[PDB]
Design a protein around this ligand. Structure first.
Ligand code: WAY
Ligand code: CA
Ligand code: ZN
Ligand code: ZN
Length: 158
């Protein structure tokens, strides 16, 4: 039902958090766009400076909102629906341990999940779908959006 009115989108990383090196964090987001861009004609462009539609940043317990985090476990990240400048935003918990290996909460698992919500997809009930309401580790070596997600994302963007 909710979807972007244009196939052009831009994003900007506010910070890379000291939990991982910038090179490791940059590839993590690129893999997410690659997996989603594989079955969506959406075009993602990285902006060096200025304000972008989807800005990513890492916050801490208090984050100027009536939705404080509950500590390390709990809300690993959250985003707002496809709105004007405020919408399409994405925040991450800096109090958690972000790693690219199988430890704590993998950044790619949460990153891909918020993108699914920003794409207009709702939580999926299939355990193999990334939109699964429960966090689960998966082999990112050959992981591809399952048929459930492909039929849903295609049903929205075609
Ligand atoms: C795999 O990607 C993700 C991304 C976010 C989250 S999450 O913890 O924020 N998450 C799901 C959840 C998880 C375990 C127990 N209860 C709820 C949520 C939680 C905890 C609270 C409220 C909203 C969500 C949510 O759906 N955000 O998109 C979990 C997994
Ligand atoms: Ca939390
Ligand atoms: Zn936030
Ligand atoms: Zn969710």
């Amino acid at each position: 039902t909710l979807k972007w009115s244009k196939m052009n989108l831009t994003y900007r990383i506010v910070n890379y958090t000291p939990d991982m090196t910038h090179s490791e964090v940059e590839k993590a987001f690129k893999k997410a766009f690659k997996v989603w861009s594989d079955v969506t004609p959406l075009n993602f462009t990285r902006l060096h400076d200025g304000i972008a539609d989807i800005m990513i940043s890492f916050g801490i317990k208090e984050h100027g909102d009536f939705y404080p985090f509950d500590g390390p476990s709990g809300l690993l990240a959250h985003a707002f629906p496809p709105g004007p400048n405020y919408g399409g935003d994405a925040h991450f918990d800096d109090d958690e341990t972000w790693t690219s290996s199988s430890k704590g909460y993998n950044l790619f698992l949460v990153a891909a999940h918020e993108f699914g919500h920003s794409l207009g997809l709702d939580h999926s009930k299939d355990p193999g779908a990334l939109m699964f309401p429960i966090y689960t580790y998966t082999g990112k070596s050959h992981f591809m959006l399952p048929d459930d997600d492909v039929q849903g994302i295609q049903s929205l963007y075609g």
